[PDB]
From a paper:
Curli proteins are produced via dedicated and tightly regulated cellular processes, and their fibrils mediate host cell adhesion and invasion, lead to immune system activation, and scaffold bacterial communities known as biofilms. The two key players in curli fibril formation are CsgA and CsgB, the major and minor curli subunits, respectively. CsgA, a 151-residue protein, consists of five imperfect sequence repeats (R1-R5), defined by regularly spaced serine (Ser), glutamine (Gln) and asparagine (Asn) residues. The first and the last repeats (R1 and R5) form amyloid fibrils in isolation and are critical to CsgA seeding and nucleation by CsgB, while the other repeats (R2-R4) contain 'gatekeeper' residues that temper the amyloidogenicity of CsgA.
However, while 45LNIYQY50 (R1), 47IYQYGG52 (R1), and 137VTQVGF142 (R5) formed unbranched and elongated amyloid-like fibrils, the 129TASNSS134 (R4-R5 loop) segment formed scarce and more amorphous structures. The 45LNIYQY50 (R1), 47IYQYGG52 (R1), and 137VTQVGF142 (R5) segments bound the amyloid indicator dye ThT and demonstrated dose-dependent amyloid fibrillation curves with short lag times. 45LNIYQY50 polymerized with the shortest lag time. 45LNIYQY50 and 47IYQYGG52, which are overlapping segments from the R1 repeat, adopted very similar structures. Both segments, as well as 137VTQVGF142 (R5), adopted a classical amyloid steric zipper architecture, with two possible dry interfaces between paired β-sheets. The β-strands were oriented parallel to each other along the β-sheets. These three structures are class 1 steric zippers, as defined by Sawaya and Eisenberg according to the organization of the β-strands and β-sheets. Specifically, the R1 45LNIYQY50 and 47IYQYGG52 segments and the R5 137VTQVGF142 segment formed fibrils that bound the amyloid indicator dye ThT and formed canonical amyloid class 1 steric zippers. These segments contain Gln49 or Gln139 (marked in bold in 45LNIYQY50, 47IYQYGG52, and 137VTQVGF142), which are critical for fibrillation and cannot be mutated to asparagine without interfering with curli assembly. The R1 segment 45LNIYQY50 and the R5 segment 137VTQVGF142 also induced fibrillation of Aβ1–40. In agreement with the hypothesis that the steric zipper segments serve as spines of CsgA fibrils, we found that the D-peptides also inhibited the fibrillation of the R1 45LNIYQY50 and R5 137VTQVGF142 spine segments in a dose-dependent manner.
Numbering used by the authors:
A (entry chain A), B (entry chain A), C (entry chain A), D (entry chain A), E (entry chain A), F (entry chain A), ...: 1 to 6
The structure:
Amino acid sequence: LNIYQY
Amino acid sequence: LNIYQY
Amino acid sequence: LNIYQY
Amino acid sequence: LNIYQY
Amino acid sequence: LNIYQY
Amino acid sequence: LNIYQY
Amino acid sequence: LNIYQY
Amino acid sequence: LNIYQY
Amino acid sequence: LNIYQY
Amino acid sequence: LNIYQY
Amino acid sequence: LNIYQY
Amino acid sequence: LNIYQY
Amino acid sequence: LNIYQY
Amino acid sequence: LNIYQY
Amino acid sequence: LNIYQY
Amino acid sequence: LNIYQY
Amino acid sequence: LNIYQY
Amino acid sequence: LNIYQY
């Protein structure tokens, strides 16, 4: 699980 | 699961 | 689990 | 678990 | 567990 | 457990 | 447990 | 346990 | 246990 | 200029 | 200029 | 200029 | 200039 | 200039 | 200038 | 100038 | 100038 | 000038 939140 | 949120 | 929050 | 919060 | 909080 | 709080 | 608080 | 508090 | 308090 | 490279 | 490199 | 490099 | 390097 | 290097 | 080096 | 070196 | 070296 | 060296 990789989560990138910008 | 890869999630990219811009 | 990698979480990046900007 | 790696968490980066900016 | 690595947590980076800026 | 490594915690960095700025 | 390493804790860095600035 | 290492704790750094600034 | 090492504690640094500034 | 927005560049997304995966 | 925003650059995202994965 | 924002640069994200993973 | 913000640079994030992982 | 903010630089984050992991 | 803020520099974080891990 | 703030420099954090781990 | 603040310098933290671990 | 604050210098912390561990």
